[PDB]
Amino acid sequence: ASSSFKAADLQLEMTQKPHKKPGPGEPLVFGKTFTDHMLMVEWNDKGWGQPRIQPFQNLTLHPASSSLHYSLQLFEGMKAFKGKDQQVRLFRPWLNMDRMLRSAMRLCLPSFDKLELLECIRRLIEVDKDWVPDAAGTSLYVRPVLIGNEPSLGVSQPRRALLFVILCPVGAYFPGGSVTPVSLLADPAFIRAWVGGVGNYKLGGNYGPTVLVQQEALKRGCEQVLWLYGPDHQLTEVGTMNIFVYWTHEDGVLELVTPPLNGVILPGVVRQSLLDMAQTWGEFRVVERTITMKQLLRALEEGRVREVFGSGTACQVCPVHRILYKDRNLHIPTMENGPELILRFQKELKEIQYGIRAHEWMFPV
Amino acid sequence: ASSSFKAADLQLEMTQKPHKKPGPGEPLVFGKTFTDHMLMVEWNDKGWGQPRIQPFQNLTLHPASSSLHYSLQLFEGMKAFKGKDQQVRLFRPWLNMDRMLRSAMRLCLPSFDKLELLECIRRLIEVDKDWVPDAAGTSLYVRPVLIGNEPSLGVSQPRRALLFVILCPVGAYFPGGSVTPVSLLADPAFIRAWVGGVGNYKLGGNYGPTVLVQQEALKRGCEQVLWLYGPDHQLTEVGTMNIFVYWTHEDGVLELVTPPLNGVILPGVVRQSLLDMAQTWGEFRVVERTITMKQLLRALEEGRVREVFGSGTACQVCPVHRILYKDRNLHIPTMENGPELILRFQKELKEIQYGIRAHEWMFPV
Ligand SMILES: *Cc1c(COP(=O)(O)O)cnc(C)c1O
Ligand SMILES: *Cc1c(COP(=O)(O)O)cnc(C)c1O
Incomplete structure (x- = not known):
């Protein structure tokens, strides 16, 4: 041809x-x-x-x-x-x-x-x-x-x-003018993608099966789905957005972390831009690493979590304030800690x- | 409803x-x-x-x-x-x-x-x-x-x-009641479906990703793909057909086994018919149990495997004669063992x- x-x-x-x-x-x-x-x-x-x-x-x-x-x-x-x-x-x-x-x-x-x-x-x-x-x-x-x-x-x-x-x-x-946070349903029973699958490609087939799951999030009082994967329940993505966590990790170093591109994550354009931007500032550690609910829970009651948000073309930087895990509501202090990072990200992109x-x-x- | x-x-x-x-x-x-x-x-x-x-x-x-x-x-x-x-x-x-x-x-x-x-x-x-x-x-x-x-x-x-x-x-x-066997590529890197996924439903999304994999099977010299799943490399399905193994199990009893309807198996109509039919005869053990390559390898070098075949509407009972596993070709004695069970199943269905x-x-x- x-x-x-x-x-x-x-x-x-x-x-x-x-x-x-x-x-x-x-x-x-x-x-x-x-x-x-x-x-x-x-x-x-x-x-x-x-x-x-x-x-x-x-x-x-x-x-x-x-x-x-x-x-x-x-x-x-x-x-x-x-x-x-x-x-x-x-x-x-x-x-x-x-x-x-x-x-x-x-x-x-x-x-x-x-x-x-x-x-x-x-x-x-x-x-x-x-x-x-x-x-x-x-x-x-x-x-x-x-x-x-x-x-x-x-x-x-x-x-x-x-x-x-x-x-x-x-x-x-x-929200229009402001930046209102969303609540998420985190149930390990729902699977969006798997290692060796095609979750890292924007293929129609990846979305059809999520319609029913999203309905379950609503009927359960949540606005979006936090997709969990693996035995260790790692956080992969939120709805159709990549997920970021801004906290002071175990080693006590402040960092911005987002799951690595290992096959189950869609390589978001906003995602890459946020990493690029934060890496350019050179003000704190920026890494791609798996994130587990275990780490999140520990980080939550140790007061180490500052902000949690999703990133995507539809909603550039989306604050998260609640995650419904094991029948248990987890408050995410994102808004309490003025979404400082979120706000700086949003200003810069704008x-x-x-x-x-x-x-x-x-x-x- | x-x-x-x-x-x-x-x-x-x-x-x-x-x-x-x-x-x-x-x-x-x-x-x-x-x-x-x-x-x-x-x-x-x-x-x-x-x-x-x-x-x-x-x-x-x-x-x-x-x-x-x-x-x-x-x-x-x-x-x-x-x-x-x-x-x-x-x-x-x-x-x-x-x-x-x-x-x-x-x-x-x-x-x-x-x-x-x-x-x-x-x-x-x-x-x-x-x-x-x-x-x-x-x-x-x-x-x-x-x-x-x-x-x-x-x-x-x-x-x-x-x-x-x-x-x-x-x-x-x-071509003419031919009933010729097919060779399969068994590479653990592929993965057709996941527990918690939608592999057990006939949704278009399950097939698109297999086109590239099938092409790799041809390039490797095989005709179809043997879908493996899990750390233990269990045999789930062949191409778009369910898989059956007729052998002398490890406990010494002769049986016809096919994988269980957990989430990674499409509940085939031919598959159910074959189980129904074989159970009706009451001549040997019929069971739905997981099948691993490990088990296949031993049964094979112990001359315990009699026939291996796929089942589906397009190809009712399809003989398998070769499986390319770890760069290693495994001969499947299906045709040697006078294709007994397969021939009996084809006749009854006909x-x-x-x-x-x-x-x-x-x-x-
Ligand atoms: C579209 C999408 C994203 C984000 O990608 P952007 O290129 O930043 O818009 C993340 N995850 C999923 C599942 C998506 O479909
Ligand atoms: C169609 C199909 C089968 C076989 O189902 P039949 O109802 O017996 O035709 C088995 N596995 C897959 C993946 C299929 O698409």
Whole structure:
């Protein structure tokens, strides 16, 4: 096949049926509202077809499409922010393209040029730029997707695939102005991923099984799930966010710790940014190490825990105030210790993402 | 328990240009050929819509459909056999409806009436009766599917879903009652499922990750993957088939063992039928117990292993002759021991499935 698709061959098809732009009491609910256009690229045995920006529209799929029978599907999630200047910028897009390609290979889906995809994405955002909000805390969510599309019930490498990208204006989850903490359910019975599995890839298959578990967290009074793994009940992730703990460890050294990338953790872009940032300050120890409930419990009643939070594109730095472990509620002093670290992290990202401070992390328009 | 969707409400729209059935003597690649009609039922806040048999046609899905982003998809697989009298019968369909409903609940998808679905399926196959082959070893593969279909990027219980069924005429795994054995790759690095996971449900998410692993088996010279689990390397399944071992156990008694239905085993319909059948004979011990490579190695060098095989709808009883474990090829004496048990199982099933012997296991037309 010919290399992979190119931004120079983009075909533009403008919408004739514009969508009404969010205008109510400004109620932006994540993943519900879509912009006017979308990216679409098809892959055959002839290889990749020409990239196309077209009006948002339904997909037409053969009933035996492997994307629907054997979960040959993966996705990404990243944000575009509009600064006061009106300039739109994407936050570390390159990392998302890297991760997306890794996912593609894991599922035997067609490789592509990451810089070519980023360009097409840039062109798509340009076309729908008017959908990018600028109110404090708002942004545009970009959702690239790659699916196998073989008209065959055989479980095998697809010879046809489909890559598309859709956009959603978002208004930052819920609290709006403040930063309210969440409570978590920690029950060892629920398993999200395993060593040797595919938890470290953003594949649709990893999420479907969590819907029921999340419902159990609600019916139990919690807002999200703290995923535990292993006999030692290590803390892997929170909902769909990586987890960080800021405390003074056993050796009495103050540190920021987050589980290591050993197969069951999704390598979050925000996660990597927080480590990079904290490592740059050089004010305290920053490490990737397994974290156990045992260590947490001991640390809690020894008054060593300062802040616990999740990190992810949807909720950059999310405070945790309660963890329901063994029928036992554990209060997490995050807010008591002014979320000092959380607050500094949030300030820094805000400055970087909205262009207040120039940074290599931001990708123009 | 919430029920709905009835068969006496079937809307019916006959094809308009019937495709021509496959060619006698000309092979059919399993799952590549589809019949003229399909079943389609939609679900939303208004509950289940009317069932419909319609011309095979592509699906139209919203780009944010949860079936494509978070793998809210599940499927089933069962066969219809046409006897000599041109009579068509489904093999233990009820078990597939039971399993399908279990899968539905695990993914928070809409519950439905198992008998109502079976009727709609009977009607669909009835309409496509002609597509059911009648040469030895041939049959019709039925592929029911239920997918979430929420136009939202939120990971949550869909408020819309789609249930459909498509049919494929299948050849016969063995060219001419061949019954040739397969070689397997047994590498502990792979891992298909985990205790506490969803390996015991037929969810699309369980299969996507195996494509790459299967390719590695081919490159290593094997035909299928022997899935190992745990520190003790227990044998869980082969490819997409349950595994059975017929041998002289360590206690001196002759037995037919297959792994226990803990969370890492898919409860196969053929698997249950083989256990039922062998228990009915009352000729030897039949047990569900864990099987380790360690046990396999000893029994093997002690000449205690008689036959090893996989079981599944696609390949009812599949002989295994070689297992590539630690870089070391293990010969499995299955064919040497006159393929006794396997041949007896294939014959009994053949008699039951093609109506040679009346049996409660068969469901008419
Ligand atoms: C998306 C996701 C994350 C966070 O990744 P970001 O790239 O920082 O958005 C963490 N864990 C899971 C399970 C995720 O799906
Ligand atoms: C389909 C399947 C089986 C066999 O089930 P049958 O109901 O006997 O067809 C076994 N294991 C896996 C992983 C399967 O997908």
